[PDB]
Each structure stands twice: as structure tokens, then as C-alpha cells.
Amino acid sequence: MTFGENR
Amino acid sequence: TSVKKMTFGENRDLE
Amino acid sequence: MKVISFLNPKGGSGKTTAVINIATALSRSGYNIAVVDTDPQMSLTNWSKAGKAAFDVFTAASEKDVYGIRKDLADYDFAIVDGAGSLSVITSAAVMVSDLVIIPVTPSPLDFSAAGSVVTVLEAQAYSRKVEARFLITRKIEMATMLNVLKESIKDTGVKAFRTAITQRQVYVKSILDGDSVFESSDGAAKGEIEILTKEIVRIFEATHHH
Amino acid sequence: MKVISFLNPKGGSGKTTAVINIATALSRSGYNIAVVDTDPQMSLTNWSKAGKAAFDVFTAASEKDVYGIRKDLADYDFAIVDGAGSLSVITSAAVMVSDLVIIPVTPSPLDFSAAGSVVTVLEAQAYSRKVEARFLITRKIEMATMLNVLKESIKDTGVKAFRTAITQRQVYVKSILDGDSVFESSDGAAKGEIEILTKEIVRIFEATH
Ligand SMILES: Nc1ncnc2c1ncn2[C@@H]1O[C@H](COP(=O)(O)OP(=O)(O)NP(=O)(O)O)[C@@H](O)[C@H]1O
Ligand SMILES: Nc1ncnc2c1ncn2[C@@H]1O[C@H](COP(=O)(O)OP(=O)(O)NP(=O)(O)O)[C@@H](O)[C@H]1O
């Protein structure tokens, strides 16, 4: 999730 | 629902 | 005349599928629509050679064919672009000559990979001529988790996204196998959303007649 | 050491998602596996930034890094390449240094297009060193009408496939959304097929031992 927001 | 269901497979095969 | 593009350098993003169903929805609504296929594999074209489409189909051999669209398909009402699945100049070309850019993204983590690409070529174009843009959720599955993980990504970018999304349905696929679109079948789950999504696009150019 | 490659220019074919679950399954059996990420977006590499990974990750700065494989990853029992979702030099580089080339294809017809350009790169390599080839049906769905079309798309090319198609399940997605394979899930429907698909992959190397 943490990286999902990032993209 | 009808018409061209094989003509694509047929050619995806040719490619 | 207005140009419209479906650009997203990633492969399973449903660009082609969207273009067809959306274009049909526009033609059967009165307008005259011409579509330009820019795929080196000519999937949309290979499709058009079978059942009669409701819009006009063309085929590009290079970016030379895209840069001159405002010239060739000028008598038409809308020019749609099925962008190449590659990270080519087509994405660069398209934006250069468009009144609207649609970025198809799917509910997945590996899909938002080069979706960010298009966004920067538009901001980069914003200098010479402001080009509108909207993201398009596609193959929307039922996962609140992933939907937010994308929804958030679609926000940081700084661009809008159509209130409606393209759901995943075995019809959107089954229809391309035969040769029809989605309006050549009784399924009313899709026949509706496409029609609603299309009504949005019409509103966008409605605000260009207002100002 | 041996090299397995997953190539297909088409981006909806699940090349990245397959590798994660097959290589993960390959490590659990006692094998030391290493995977090379050639996608310019580096997906199999970002996903693995989650620690959870039974294999080793090596990113590719260019095709020059895909070529000198046996000179570097020579210590691993296996080296697997996440294909590039673009028509490029990658496909050409891979086949040249492989012992097996797996080609993911989906039910959707227009998803088989580039299945061709690849099959003709192998036909070229046969002149120097024939590279084994197999088609891997992924994201399968019970669509008879649609699967006969894909069943035939393969036949013509004249290459064997896999009696174990990777099915379409939500677990193959959520698992990746957190940073795991499908072996980190209660879901046993997926772990099954892969454990049987992987077995197949090894059989190709037994006939020759
Ligand atoms: N709304 C949808 N519902 C169900 N299946 C879909 C939908 N949109 C796309 N698909 C399927 O997913 C695949 C990917 O769609 P497609 O439009 O071909 O992507 P692209 O981005 O056009 N692919 P490419 O031209 O290789 O970049 C297709 O083969 C479709 O069959
Ligand atoms: N067996 C499967 N079940 C469910 N979803 C799948 C499966 N295989 C692939 N997908 C999904 O389909 C999308 C495309 O898969 P992906 O593995 O990213 O393709 P790629 O080959 O990685 N694409 P590209 O990098 O453009 O070549 C992803 O969002 C995956 O989550």
C-alpha cells in the first residue's frame, strides 16, 4: 500500500 | 452476439 | 474538429478495448467519428476487417501519420487515437496534436508503471498549448483496497479522472472475439456505463463552447 | 546453471506476475534462484523492495547486463528473466542466452499478437543452438469459445504448451499488492496449479541430465 500511494 | 469469432483466432495463428 | 487520445505505455491497460466501445457510443449518438490505429501489431485494424464498425477506421505507419491528423481527418467530428503499447514517439506525437488526452489505468500495482509517463509529456506540452487530460479506470474489479491504492496515485498526479469507470466483464472481451462492440449485444451493464462515460466527454467540449 | 526466460511484448500477458510465483516455488524445492528485471519501469524489482522474496533480484541497466549472465549468475541453479513488455532488443538478447523460453499468452485474442515475433526469434537461434520453447497459458478462464481460438493460435507455431494453465484469481493480485507471492496466502487453489506447473518446468531438464 505504502508504495501504491507512491506510484 | 455473433459474426466473426474464428477469423481472429485463425489469424492470430498465422502471425 | 477535436482530437482525442488514449495513451498509456502499458499493455493490459485496455486502451484498444476502450477506444472501440467509446467511439461506437459516440457515432451511434450522431457524430461522425474517425479512429486512428497506431499499433505496430494492428490489433484494432485486424478487428475492423470483419464486422462493420460504426466509426471510420484508419491505420498509421509512423508518427508522420499522427502529426498530420488535423489535416487528413478534418471533415470528421472526432479523431480518436489507439496509442501504441510501446514507449515510443507516438505518445509524444499524440499529445502534441490533441484537445483531450485519456490515460487508461487498471486496478493493479504493475500497471501504474509507465502511466506516469504520459502525465509529464502533457505538463511538458502545457508550455506550448494547454492539453486537457483525464484518467480512466478500466477493468474495474471489486477491491476497495486496490481501488484506493490507485485512486490515491491518480490524485498525486494532479489530474482529474472520470466519475465513471469501465468494469471488467466477459462481454467486453467476448464482443471483440466476434467483431461487435458492446452495443451489439443485450448486456445492459456495459451499454450503460459506456454511454454515461461518453456523455462526460461531450461535456468537456461543452465548456469550450461556453468559454 | 540454466536460464529460463519469460518473453512476450504484450503487456497484459502476466510475465512479471508469473515469474514471482514460479521462481518462489522454485526456491522452496531447494533450488537457488536468481531473477533479472529488464523492464525499464522495474516492477519485479520494486515489488521485491518488500523483503519477502525467496529468490534473488538483479535489475538490468541495459541489454549488456542480460548478455553476461553465465559470467555472473553462474552460481545459481537458475536464472530467470522478467521479459520486457516492449518490442525491443531484449527479446533478441534473451533467447541468445537461454536454455528454455516460456511465452505467456492470455485468452483474449488480440493478446496473442506478439506471441509471433518471439517464436520467430527462436526459429533464428536454431541455427547456432536450438533453444527449447513452450507456451504458457496464463489468466485462463473457462471460455470454451475463446480457448479454442487460443488453443489454435498455439498449434500453428508448432510448439508444445503446458497442460497446466495459470488461472485468473484475485489472489495473484492482492498478494503482489502487499509484496508477496501466492505462497504467502491461505488460498490453495493457486498454490496448486503453480506447484504442478513448476514441476513441469523441471521435467524439461530431467530428460537430459
Ligand atoms: N472492461 C474490460 N472488461 C473485460 N476485459 C477487458 C476490458 N478491457 C480490456 N479487457 C481485456 O484485457 C485485454 C487488454 O485490453 P487491450 O485493450 O487489448 O489493452 P491495450 O492497452 O489495448 N493492449 P496493447 O495494445 O497491447 O497495449 C484485452 O485483450 C481485453 O480482452
Ligand atoms: N494469473 C493471473 N491472475 C490474476 N491477475 C493476473 C494474472 N496474471 C497477471 N495478472 C494481472 O494482469 C496485469 C498484467 O500482469 P503483469 O504481470 O503486470 O504483466 P507484464 O507482463 O508484467 N506486463 P508488462 O510489464 O507490460 O510486460 C497485472 O495487473 C497483474 O496483476
Side-chain angles (χ1 to χ4, degrees), chain A, chain B residues 1-2 4-14, chain C residues 1-207 210, chain D residues 1-208:
Chain A
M1 305 190 76
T2 301
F3 76 91
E5 226 239 72
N6 187 74
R7 270 266 178 37
Chain B
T1 312
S2 67
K4 247 56 156 152
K5 0 218 44 132
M6 330 284 54
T7 129
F8 297 82
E10 295 180 8
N11 229 59
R12 278 349 185 167
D13 306 347
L14 254 355
Chain C
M1 183 280 273
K2 314 294 170 181
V3 187
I4 290 81
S5 299
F6 284 53
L7 311 162
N8 193 285
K10 180 75 170 68
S13 58
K15 296 175 284 69
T16 304
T17 299
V19 180
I20 298 301
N21 296 305
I22 302 313
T24 293
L26 272 171
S27 202
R28 278 167 22 98
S29 295
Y31 309 84
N32 261 270
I33 283 242
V35 176
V36 173
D37 170 57
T38 66
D39 183 6
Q41 305 295 312
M42 284 169 72
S43 305
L44 192 166
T45 296
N46 203 208
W47 174 76
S48 81
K49 119 299 166 89
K52 157 125 184 310
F55 50 85
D56 279 297
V57 179
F58 288 99
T59 298
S62 75
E63 68 294 313
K64 173 215 66 81
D65 276 309
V66 188
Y67 288 135
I69 281 165
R70 293 195 178 283
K71 189 178 140 52
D72 318 295
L73 343 177
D75 299 67
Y76 295 101
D77 289 298
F78 286 101
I80 319 299
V81 177
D82 180 350
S86 282
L87 327 161
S88 53
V89 64
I90 285 74
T91 317
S92 191
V95 184
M96 213 186 293
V97 294
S98 301
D99 304 87
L100 173 55
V101 180
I102 315 192
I103 301 164
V105 289
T106 82
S108 210
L110 302 190
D111 201 284
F112 215 78
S113 56
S117 177
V118 177
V119 185
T120 42
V121 187
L122 264 163
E123 299 188 317
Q125 162 79 52
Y127 175 79
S128 301
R129 183 178 68 78
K130 163 251 190 174
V131 183
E132 212 86 24
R134 299 292 188 291
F135 280 71
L136 184 60
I137 315 81
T138 160
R139 317 185 57 180
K140 182 190 147 203
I141 39 74
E142 275 315 321
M143 289 164 84
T145 329
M146 248 141 62
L147 225 54
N148 269 58
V149 181
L150 181 71
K151 143 265 195 71
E152 293 260 348
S153 298
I154 314 164
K155 180 56 213 304
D156 294 294
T157 56
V159 189
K160 292 124 294 175
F162 293 126
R163 303 141 109 281
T164 316
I166 307 300
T167 317
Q168 154 165 296
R169 302 214 173 66
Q170 223 174 58
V171 57
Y172 278 126
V173 186
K174 155 82 178 309
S175 86
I176 284 58
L177 188 71
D178 356 24
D180 302 25
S181 65
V182 291
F183 298 75
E184 280 79 73
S185 63
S186 62
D187 190 304
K191 191 176 299 183
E193 58 199 57
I194 302 299
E195 196 203 72
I196 299 300
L197 157 65
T198 286
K199 293 158 163 289
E200 283 201 66
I201 298 166
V202 163
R203 281 297 84 87
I204 306 300
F205 299 119
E206 204 58 287
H210 112 270
Chain D
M1 189 277 232
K2 299 292 175 180
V3 186
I4 284 165
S5 302
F6 295 74
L7 312 166
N8 189 293
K10 184 75 188 207
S13 75
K15 291 182 293 299
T16 298
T17 293
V19 175
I20 297 305
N21 295 298
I22 301 165
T24 283
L26 268 173
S27 257
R28 295 151 59 73
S29 299
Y31 289 132
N32 286 275
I33 301 81
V35 171
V36 187
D37 192 54
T38 64
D39 188 334
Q41 294 307 276
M42 311 168 55
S43 322
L44 194 161
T45 284
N46 277 317
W47 164 78
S48 61
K49 290 280 165 57
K52 317 198 198 62
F55 54 91
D56 271 281
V57 177
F58 294 81
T59 310
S62 72
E63 47 291 305
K64 164 218 60 191
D65 290 277
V66 187
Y67 276 125
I69 286 170
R70 306 169 178 296
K71 191 271 180 172
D72 308 310
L73 315 178
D75 289 37
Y76 295 76
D77 286 294
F78 278 112
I80 290 75
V81 194
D82 182 13
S86 324
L87 288 98
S88 56
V89 57
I90 303 299
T91 302
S92 187
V95 183
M96 189 178 279
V97 284
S98 303
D99 297 320
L100 172 66
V101 180
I102 300 166
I103 312 298
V105 279
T106 76
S108 50
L110 61 177
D111 205 302
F112 188 85
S113 75
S117 59
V118 179
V119 190
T120 58
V121 186
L122 269 163
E123 278 163 46
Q125 184 69 40
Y127 207 64
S128 338
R129 195 181 55 72
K130 171 148 69 65
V131 187
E132 208 76 341
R134 297 291 190 292
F135 281 72
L136 177 58
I137 313 300
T138 312
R139 312 200 57 189
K140 174 193 168 192
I141 31 165
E142 300 312 324
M143 270 206 78
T145 53
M146 174 67 85
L147 264 71
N148 221 46
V149 172
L150 174 56
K151 251 180 57 184
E152 299 178 65
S153 296
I154 305 161
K155 200 76 80 301
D156 284 55
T157 75
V159 181
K160 298 126 300 183
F162 276 130
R163 311 140 62 262
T164 312
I166 300 165
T167 325
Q168 180 209 194
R169 292 194 168 71
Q170 266 188 46
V171 59
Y172 280 110
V173 188
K174 206 73 173 57
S175 69
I176 271 74
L177 177 73
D178 296 294
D180 346 298
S181 60
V182 308
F183 285 86
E184 279 78 68
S185 60
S186 302
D187 185 324
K191 295 192 284 199
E193 48 202 50
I194 294 166
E195 287 240 309
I196 323 300
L197 156 54
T198 298
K199 257 193 170 303
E200 291 199 64
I201 297 165
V202 180
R203 289 256 129 71
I204 307 165
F205 294 108
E206 276 185 303
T208 340

